[PDB]
Amino acid sequence: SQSIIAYTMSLGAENSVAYSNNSIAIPINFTISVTTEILPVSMTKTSV
Amino acid sequence: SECVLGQSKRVDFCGKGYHLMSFPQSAPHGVVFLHVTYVPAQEKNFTTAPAICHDGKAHFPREGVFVSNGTHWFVTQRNFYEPQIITTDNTFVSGNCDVVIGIVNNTVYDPLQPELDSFKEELDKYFKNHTSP
Amino acid sequence: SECVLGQSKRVDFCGKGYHLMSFPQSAPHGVVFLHVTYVPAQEKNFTTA
Amino acid sequence: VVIGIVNNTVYDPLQPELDSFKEELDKYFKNHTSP
Amino acid sequence: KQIYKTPPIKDFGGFNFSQILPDPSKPSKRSFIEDLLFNKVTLQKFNGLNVLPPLLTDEMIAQYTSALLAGTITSGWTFGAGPALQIPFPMQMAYRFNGIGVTQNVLYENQKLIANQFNSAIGKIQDSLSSTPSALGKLQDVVNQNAQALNTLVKQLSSNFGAISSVLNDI
C-alpha cells in the first residue's frame, strides 16, 4: 500500500550516556574500515 | 600532500576516525581516495581513579589510565584494553596525596626489588653457608 | 571538526594561545564558539646551560 | 665538542639503593664475625 | 548522528556549565548565552518576490548544539571517532593539558584554582556580548546587505528608463 506521505524529519536515534565520576569505557577489540571520497578537479575547456 | 604523503592528526580530515593511510585513484574530471581508518569495536565499562598514593606520595601514570574491574588495579592504553601490573617505571611521583580529590589506596610494585629480592634470598643463603666453617 | 571534536595543535587556529577545548552555540544565520585557552602568567629570568 | 657545557655532580638513584644494601651488608659481615 | 543527552546530575568536579547548558524553563530549549544572540540581532511581497523558510527550524538546530555539547562534556573527543566512551570530567582536562606539554599533575594539585578560573571567565562572556554593541557586526551585516539589495530592486520599478512614464498601465 505504498503512497505519498508527509511527516516530520528524524534527526537520528536518541541515545543516553551513563556518566559517573569514577567510570571509564575502554574498548577490547577494534576494526578497520575504508571509505570513499569524491572531488571534482577540472572542468571541460571551451573557446568561442 | 597530507593524507597520502603522511599521517594527518587533523580529525575528520582524512576519513571519519583515526587515519592510517590512503590510496588515490583516477576518474574522469575528478579524483577518488580510499581513506583507511581505524575504529574501536565494542567496549567494556570499568572503575577508575585519577591518581594513587602508596606511601603518601601520589603516583600518576607515565602513559595510560588507571583501571580496575573491582578487585585489582592496573594501567592500560587509552584505545586498547591490556592490563599490566603496576610498577615503578609505569608511574612518576610528584608530591603527597593530601591534595588530590578522589584518590584511592593500593600498593605499587618496584621492578628493581625482585632481582634484589632474588639476591637477598641468595645473599641470606650465602651467610648460612658461611656459618659451617 | 577540529576545535570542538578534538584538541587542535595548529597555532592560533582555535583561540589565541594554547588550546584546550571549545563550545558551540547557535545564532541566527551563524555560529559562535567559546575557545578556552591557556596563557602563561608573570615569569622569572634564569641561568641555563 | 659541545660548547657552553658546565660541570656538576649528578644524583644516581640506584647508588643509595645498592649502597644502603651494601652498607647493611658491611654490617652483616661485621655481625657475622661475632658468633 | 546520534542525539546525546546529559544526565540531570551536575557534579562536574566543581566546573559550572549552567550558562551554556540548555535551560528547560524556556519554551525553546536554548541556554542562557544563546537567547541574547537571538535578541541582539535586529531582523509574500508585492511584485513576485518570495522568501522560503529553511528546512531546519530554529528550534531544530538548537537540538544539534545541545547534542554536540552533551557529547563533549562526558565523552571528550571519542564520540566523534566511533562509539562514544564516557570519562570523568576531572580527568578529561588532565588529558587536555598533555596536549600542550604540561604534565597532568598540575591540574590535580591546582584543581580548585583552575575550577574558579574557568567559572569566572564564563560569566565575563555574557555581559561582554550584551554591553558592547560592536560584537555582532559580522552577523548583523549579512542581513542588512541582503535586505539592502532586495529593497533597492523594488525602488527601481519607479525608474523612467528613458520613457515618458514609469507605470506600465498609463503608458
Swiss-Prot record, chain B:
<feature type="disulfide bond">
    <location>
        <begin position="53"/>
        <end position="97"/>
    </location>
</feature>
<comment type="function">
    <text>Subunit of the fusion protein that is processed upon entry into the host cell. Mediates fusion of the virion and cellular membranes by functioning as a class I viral fusion protein. Contains a viral fusion peptide that is unmasked after S2 cleavage. This cleavage can occur at the cell membrane by host TMPRSS2 or during endocytosis by host CSTL. In either case, this triggers an extensive and irreversible conformational change that leads to fusion of the viral envelope with the cellular cytoplasmic membrane, releasing viral genomic RNA into the host cell cytoplasm.</text>
</comment>
<protein>
    <recommendedName>
        <fullName>Spike protein S2'</fullName>
    </recommendedName>
</protein>
<feature type="glycosylation site" description="N-linked (GlcNAc...) (complex) asparagine; by host">
    <location>
        <position position="129"/>
    </location>
</feature>
<feature type="disulfide bond">
    <location>
        <begin position="3"/>
        <end position="14"/>
    </location>
</feature>
<feature type="glycosylation site" description="N-linked (GlcNAc...) (hybrid) asparagine; by host">
    <location>
        <position position="45"/>
    </location>
</feature>
<feature type="glycosylation site" description="N-linked (GlcNAc...) (complex) asparagine; by host">
    <location>
        <position position="105"/>
    </location>
</feature>
<feature type="glycosylation site" description="N-linked (GlcNAc...) (complex) asparagine; by host">
    <location>
        <position position="69"/>
    </location>
</feature>
